Amino acid sequence: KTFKQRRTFEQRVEDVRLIREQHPTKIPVIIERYKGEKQLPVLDKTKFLVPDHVNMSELIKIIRRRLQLNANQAFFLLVNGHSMVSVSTPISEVYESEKDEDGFLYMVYASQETF
């Protein structure tokens, strides 16, 4: 069901190396709905190539637009399992400290801060 379940560590590693080769300016992001989530829709895809200059605040706006949310639906984004310390950090910096050992940056969204 989840990304890590669907692909071998070997397969996730090789895919990241290919994004490096073909999309060198992009951060490879996995974005998944919280397994408990009732309110928000599922995304149309799992794997996102994010321009490495956007900050976390802009990435939240991007996903809220992708989900076509309205102004009073809540949305919380976890990175590498935990809350974002700041939305002003550039995703290139977030990648280097939060990336998985397979080389993806793993995010999860929910309508509650309590996931």
Ligand X SMILES: O=C(NC[C@@H]1CCCO1)N1CCOCC1
Q: 83-107: buried (b, 16+ CB within 10 Å) or exposed (e) per residue?
A: ebeeeebebeebbeebbbebbbbbb
Is 37 within 8 Å of 112 (Cβ atoms)? no
Q: Which does 73 bind (CB under 5 to 8 A by kind): Cl ion, ligand X, none?
A: none
Residue 94 binds which one of ligand X, Cl ion, none, with CB within 5 to 8 A depending on kind?
none
Please, which residue, 13 or 67, has the CB nearer to ligand X? Answer: 67
**Residues 7-26 as x/- pattern, contact with Cl ion by CB under 5 A:** ----------------xxx-
CB of 12 to Cl ion, least distance (A): 20
Distance (Å, whole) CA 115 – CA 109: 9
Interacting residues toward Cl ion by CB under 5 A = 23-25
